[PDB]
Design a protein around this ligand. Structure first.
Ligand SMILES: CC(C)[C@H](N)C(=O)O
Ligand SMILES: [Zn+2]
Length: 402
């Protein structure tokens, strides 16, 4: 285990471009071992960073010397860890059925893989468990297929957990998979979707990573491929695609949290998807799910030039986000990745959209920074529930607009 005792997470404000440029100088001070939750982009866009205990003075002094304002969002990250660990301990249950699974606690890799096998066994005629590959540490990579028949019917892909530290995404992916086998046949509207389409749902899209955030390092985001030449492990799975690969927004340093890999599709966990998509070919909408920041995003990340379907994408996004907000009030923003979060090269949806999958969306779930990746387990179900309203609006649109 790594501990995060007295590590703080700072929210840095930048009022102009010169300040934005200073924060990305600090980002270049490798030996600070700074973990940027939400990196430098533009003035008025919030920069979140986790700084390790030793580095805190160095960061604070640099910031004040330049008159850049910061605030402390989380005064000690290890306390949030202790709270999480504490409630998984108390929630440690025994799911032999999906109706008795605890959806309101975080689970381990095994417990989720167990869940998939209990789900396909309870509803064999709807869900299937497809293995599309094996990760670097040899773990199988699974996809659930939800289908009422057909041969190569138009499908809808959802993935979750491409970045392992984002535990709200794998947890919501598990709630959705119960949800579909619940509302099929009982929800007139949702029943019409599955009568026409297939849904592919990949819950643990980065299994080696996910297990590592339970074993050794909670705050781990990359894969676990061990690379030629370094003490340094992993590549950022959402910098590894061949869309703007190696462009601005991805690091060439293997020790960086945003290191792209040696070549596009070098990671098994990504190349499995690329082969799945390129062999399926009738995938109509592609949704990749992250956290945090409460954003719904569409192409592009790597480039300022607009996607050709911009007006439509912006309207779906407008409708979806409004459906999400109608439940719990949770405020989202939307728009193209590069304008709404930052420029970042080699993303999933920039690739899929360039493969003709027009309805390519990326979510960033709750929250907007007070817990970040350590989102309280009591929010797992509200988060899944409201994002299902948005995920439905996109599915309905796919159905309608053939
Ligand atoms: C680029 C963006 C789509 C994503 N949150 C990333 O940082 O990997
Ligand atoms: Zn992510």
């Amino acid at each position: 285990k790594e501990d995060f005792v007295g590590h703080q997470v700072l929210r840095i404000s930048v009022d102009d471009e010169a300040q934005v440029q200073k924060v990305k100088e600090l980002e270049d001070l490798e030996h600070l071992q700074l973990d940027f939750w939400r990196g430098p982009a533009r003035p008025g866009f919030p920069i979140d960073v986790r700084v390790p205990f030793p580095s805190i003075q160095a960061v604070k002094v640099f910031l004040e010397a330049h008159g850049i304002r910061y605030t402390i969002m989380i005064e000690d990250v290890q306390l949030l860890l202790d709270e999480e660990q504490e409630q998984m301990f108390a929630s440690q249950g025994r799911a032999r059925t999906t109706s008795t699974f605890n959806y309101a606690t975080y689970h381990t890799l095994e417990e989720i893989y167990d869940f998939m096998d209990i789900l396909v066994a309870e509803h064999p005629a709807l869900v299937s468990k497809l293995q599309i590959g094996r990760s670097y540490e040899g773990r199988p990579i699974y996809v659930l297929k939800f289908s009422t028949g057909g041969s190569n019917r138009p499908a809808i892909w959802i993935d979750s957990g491409i970045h392992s530290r984002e535990w709200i995404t794998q947890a919501s992916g598990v709630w959705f998979a119960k949800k579909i086998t619940e509302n099929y046949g009982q929800n007139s509207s949702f029943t019409a979707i599955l009568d026409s389409m297939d849904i592919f749902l990949e819950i643990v899209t980065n299994p080696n990573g996910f297990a590592f955030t339970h074993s050794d390092n909670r705050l781990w985001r990359k894969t676990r491929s061990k690379a030629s030449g370094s003490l340094c492990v992993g590549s950022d799975s959402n910098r590894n695609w061949d869309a703007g690969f190696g462009g601005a927004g991805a690091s060439s340093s293997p020790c960086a949290e945003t290191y792209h890999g040696k070549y596009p599709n070098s990671e098994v966990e990504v190349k499995s998807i690329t082969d799945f998509v390129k062999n399926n070919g009738n995938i109509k909408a592609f949704i990749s799910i992250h956290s945090y920041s409460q954003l719904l995003l569409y192409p592009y990340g790597y480039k300022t030039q607009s996607p050709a379907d911009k007006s439509e994408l912006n309207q779906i996004a407008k409708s979806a986000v409004a459906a999400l907000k109608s439940l719990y009030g949770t405020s989202y923003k939307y728009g193209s990745i590069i304008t709404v979060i930052y420029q970042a090269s080699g993303g999933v949806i920039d690739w899929t959209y360039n493969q003709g999958i027009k309805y390519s969306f990326s979510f960033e779930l709750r929250d907007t920074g007070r817990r970040g990746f350590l989102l309280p387990a009591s929010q797992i179900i509200p988060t899944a529930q409201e994002t299902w309203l948005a995920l439905l609006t996109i599915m309905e649109h796919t159905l309608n607009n053939s």
